[PDB]
Write a protein that binds this ligand. Structure first.
Ligand SMILES: Nc1ncnc2c1ncn2[C@@H]1O[C@H](COP(=O)(O)OP(=O)(O)O)[C@@H](O)[C@H]1O
Lengths: 481, 187
């Protein structure tokens, strides 16, 4: 039964996209809010199919009435909800399933005082008594942004979904859109895919009963702290976080799941932002958490470094078995030219360990990675050489010199000798920790391959999650070589 | 209520709704609305935008100043008047006009050219889709079955919206009409 619900939802949005190109993220987003009692905000230039999406969602229900209205500066409440005689509200807003309000950032003070009461309570003042409003989806489109200190900020804080629609960009999707013969005022949804009034009231009870796992809540536990230390982060109150749970629970209910999935957090990129400055910060902070702390991407990166540091510690401890012999060469030269090993070493940025550690540049080091392009010039011509410490930082100058037994001696500030050595051609302790970390990467990758088929997930976001998981698996495979 | 009569072609007649057989909608005024006013919704939906003015030719002013033709009569013969059946049949054949690949290269080039200039007027997706309905009918009533590149001249009275966009739309289209329309600049 729960698995068959994802098929009907995926087939319902397929018929709604007929005639609307590059609008898949806008149709699937309005469908989730229509079946959960939420709202959706659209931002963009006038003329990007912002009014057809409001008239297309009414076909998914058996009894749904549309309402199109443009809020003006001189508009009166007697024209939106209906004039009074006791109020002739036949076919307006109190008795409409889907309402459309174009340009909401320019209405009068009387309309703003009435729109904030039909969302939290869904009631209307019919003269004396009050009556409920069966509003299933509230969409609002405009073009500009409201002021930072005005009366229009109260309606923006209550709108959960805030989408930023724009014109088409693909050339192949523009030819079929410019020559579309599908009627926009027709009914392209079959009767078998249309939901009834009984299914809408039953789904509202099953949304709040979705189990909340403790591992999925850890993502919002850390994402909330990152959006508070930065001064450029948008202010997200507790009312916005409470309404985001209903949208996340309903996203997994219509996808054939009983619990909240960590992949449902991508929908938060169109709910926390509020202007053009917060768009580049919300989409960047979520992308880091979705490719870091989501599927244990960053959690396994910091754990892999401990295995590499432990492997380098065991290599520098047993460096007394393999030394470093430098062969000599003949020829006619004024200086003693030295040659490196032939086929024994071929890497350019090879690493060379050392026995007794020293204090270089007021810090400790365990391995010095040299360059093959600069080692040949120092062993023949001479002069000074450079080299970074611990494989990081800039190439600092060291006190490298030759020894009597054809070895490399590195001195510091106290004239302390240290013979260098190269790592030989995997211990049991390193292979044990590497096998346990590799098993966690396969278990985390299996969870992503079982929940990425959600309908409320964009297509361009799947390319970044797969690329981030493959980077962690490629780094752990190089250490076991 | 005027916006619903164009998209939905209906009217809220109390309870039930009824269709409106509006075949032509003409709106005239004198001035232009504000840039941040609510009147821009009806302006963005109007396809053809003509800027009429007074006469300038001296020969055409003498015959116009002394005209004996009645403006409230019927100077159209009965043989040239279309019927209700021909109007409903032509609406189906307009959308069936093929779109050649050579015409698509000119529409995408003119659209991307206006998005780079800051002083160029913005053209929405509704303006591009509705302009094809007038361009496909221009070749259907002229004896053609496909969209001709010569039909791009009609865009000079649709893309503009004020006095600042009039000198830029008529100049950008004239370059494409005398450059990439007949492979003038391509050669
Ligand atoms: N990006 C788009 N893709 C497909 N069709 C579109 C797009 N933008 C507009 N249209 C078409 O243009 C028609 C009119 O749209 P309109 O209501 O003017 O958009 P808006 O409400 O943004 O002004 C619609 O029937 C729609 O099919």
């Amino acid at each position: 039964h729960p698995h068959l619900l994802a098929e009907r939802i995926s087939r319902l949005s397929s018929s709604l996209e007929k005639g609307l190109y590059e609008r898949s993220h806008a149709i699937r987003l309005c469908l989730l809010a229509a079946l959960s009692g939420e709202s959706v905000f659209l931002l963009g230039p006038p003329g990007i199919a912002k009014s057809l999406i409001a008239r297309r969602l009414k076909f998914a229900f058996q009894n749904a009435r549309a309402f199109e209205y443009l809020m003006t500066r001189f508009s009166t409440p007697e024209e939106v909800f209906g004039p009074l005689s006791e109020r002739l509200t036949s076919g307006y807003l109190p008795e409409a399933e889907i309402v459309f309000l174009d340009e909401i950032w320019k209405a009068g003070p009387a309309i703003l005082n009435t729109l904030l009461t039909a969302i939290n309570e869904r009631q209307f003042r019919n003269g004396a008594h009050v009556e409920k409003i069966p509003m299933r989806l509230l969409v609002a489109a405009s073009n500009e942004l409201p002021e930072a200190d005005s009366s229009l900020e109260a309606l923006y804080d209550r709108m959960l979904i805030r989408l930023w629609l724009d014109k088409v960009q693909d050339k192949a999707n523009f030819r079929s859109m410019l020559t579309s013969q599908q009627d926009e005022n027709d009914n392209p949804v079959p009767d078998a895919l249309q939901v009834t009034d009984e299914e809408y009231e039953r789904w509202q009870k099953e949304i709040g009963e979705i189990t909340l796992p403790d591992h999925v809540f850890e993502l919002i536990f850390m994402l909330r702290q990152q959006l508070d230390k930065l001064p450029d982060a948008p202010y997200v109150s507790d009312r916005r976080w409470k309404k985001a749970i209903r949208l996340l629970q309903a996203s997994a209910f219509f996808s054939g799941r009983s619990a909240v999935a960590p992949v449902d957090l991508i929908l938060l990129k169109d709910c926390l932002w509020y202007d053009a400055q917060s768009l580049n910060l919300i989409q960047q902070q979520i992308d880091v958490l979705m490719t870091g702390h989501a599927w244990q991407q960053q959690g396994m990166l910091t754990r892999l470094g401990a295995i590499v540091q432990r492997h380098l510690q065991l290599q520098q401890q047993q460096s007394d078995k393999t030394a470093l012999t430098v062969i000599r060469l003949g020829g006619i030269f004024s200086r003693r030219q030295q040659y490196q090993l032939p086929v024994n070493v071929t890497a350019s940025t090879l690493t060379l360990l050392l026995q007794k550690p020293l204090k270089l540049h007021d810090m400790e080091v365990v391995h010095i990675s040299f360059e093959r392009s600069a080692l040949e010039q120092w062993l023949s011509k001479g002069g000074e050489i450079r080299g970074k410490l611990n494989g990081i930082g800039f190439a600092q100058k060291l006190n490298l010199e030759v020894d009597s037994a054809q070895h490399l001696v590195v001195r510091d500030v106290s004239l302390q000798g240290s013979t260098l050595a190269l790592p030989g051609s995997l211990p049991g302790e390193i292979k044990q920790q590497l096998e346990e970390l590799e098993s966690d990467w396969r278990k985390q990758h299996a969870l992503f391959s079982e929940q990425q088929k959600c309908l409320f997930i964009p297509g361009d976001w799947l390319g970044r999650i797969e690329a981030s998981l493959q980077d962690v698996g490629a780094q752990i495979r190089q250490a076991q070589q």
